[PDB]
């Protein structure tokens, strides 16, 4: 079953245990309802909003400003808040070809900052998402193999370097990464 709130207009399943599909569908319906309550015009167009994009850009600029001032802690926080706001306060029916590249452009800077700071697992997961969602470039496999070497996974690092060289065989950093991976693996087996 499922109960319907009155003042918040949010649907919640009052059952003891629920499946995962039911829960994610109820969450999607809640998101769509919270968007429709806010958007006024009944015949809404897939055209993106303006004030939300302005706020997101302002937050991302305030986060990028701290790099020039050499504060690598609050810059990452501001970038994370910008990404969270972009993923939270944006209606689902907005243009996908405009909603995806902004996420890519902010996630790239977040990845660079997390890699420079010292966090490697978060950066590795961000690289994996960014590569599985449709972005394959030689500037991705370099960083992915870097993380996989920093947290000591040598077979995956070698496979990543090989797949990176199978796309841009003229690269000068993937070759050094492959040399280092081969050395570490030969010390690992011998």
């Amino acid at each position: 079953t499922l109960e319907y709130n009155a003042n918040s207009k949010l649907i919640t399943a009052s059952d003891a245990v629920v499946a995962l599909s039911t829960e994610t569908n109820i969450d999607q319906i809640n998101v769509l309802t919270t968007s429709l309550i806010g958007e006024t015009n009944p015949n809404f167009t897939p055209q993106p909003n303006e004030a939300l994009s302005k706020m997101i850009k302002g937050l991302f600029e305030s986060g990028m400003k701290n790099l020039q001032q050499k504060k690598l802690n609050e810059a990452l926080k501001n970038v994370s808040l910008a990404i969270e706001m972009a993923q939270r306060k944006r209606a689902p029916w907005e243009a996908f070809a405009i909603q995806l590249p902004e996420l890519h452009f902010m996630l790239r800077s977040k990845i660079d900052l997390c890699l420079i700071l010292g966090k490697h697992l978060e950066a590795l997961q961000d690289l994996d998402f960014l590569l599985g969602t449709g972005l394959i470039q030689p500037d991705v496999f370099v960083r992915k193999a870097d993380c996989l070497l920093k947290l000591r996974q040598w077979e995956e690092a070698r496979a990543t370097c090989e797949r990176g060289l199978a796309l841009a065989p003229e690269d000068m950093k993937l070759r050094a990464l492959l040399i280092e991976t081969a050395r570490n693996l030969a010390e690992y087996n011998g």
């Binding site: 499922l2 319907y4 207009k9 649907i11 499946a19 599909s21 039911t22 994610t24 569908n25 109820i26 999607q28 319906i29 769509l32 309802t33 429709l36 309550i37 009944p42 015949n43 809404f44 167009t45 897939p46 993923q87 689902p92 029916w93 907005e94 243009a95 996908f96 909603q99 995806l100 996420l103 010292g118 966090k119 490697h120 697992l121 978060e122 997961q125 961000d126 994996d128 998402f129 599985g132 969602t133 920093k150 947290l151 996974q153």
Partner: protein, 138 residues
């Protein structure tokens, strides 16, 4: 495992408890997005199933079942679109593109949400010793 019956449940709840009007539109858009997603999935999976069947590795009844589901999805989409016409006057030309976009948007949203759970499985599998601030302590 679908969002088809959840809209009907919300509809029967509205017929009794006088819920708002936009919840119906939300459930309808969700059902339309799911129908579009399933149609694209079947359109992309058809050749591999055909090859598995021709090679003799899937059976004889599953092929008929797949061919039946192919048109069951179209019937469901037509019913959803008729209901969209019934719910709002002149909302059939834009409903399709709205669903076409919310499908991709919510798929991307789920893919991005899954990384928090994806991050701990690798810790458990590789036996990492991660302290606070995400650094390694060997």
């Amino acid at each position: 495992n679908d969002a088809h019956d959840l809209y009907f449940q919300i509809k029967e709840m509205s017929e009794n408890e006088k819920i708002h009007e936009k919840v119906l539109k939300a459930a309808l858009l969700n059902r339309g997005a799911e129908s579009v997603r399933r149609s694209l999935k079947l359109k992309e999976l058809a050749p591999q199933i055909n090859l598995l069947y021709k090679n003799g590795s899937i059976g004889e009844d599953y092929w008929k079942r797949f061919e039946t589901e192919v048109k069951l999805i179209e019937l469901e989409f037509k019913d959803t679109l008729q209901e969209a016409e019934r719910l709002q006057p002149g909302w059939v030309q834009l409903f399709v593109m709205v669903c076409k976009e919310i499908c991709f948007n919510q798929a991307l949203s789920r893919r991005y949400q899954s990384i928090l759970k994806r991050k701990e499985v690798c810790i458990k599998e590789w036996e990492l010793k991660i302290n606070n601030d995400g650094r390694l302590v060997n």
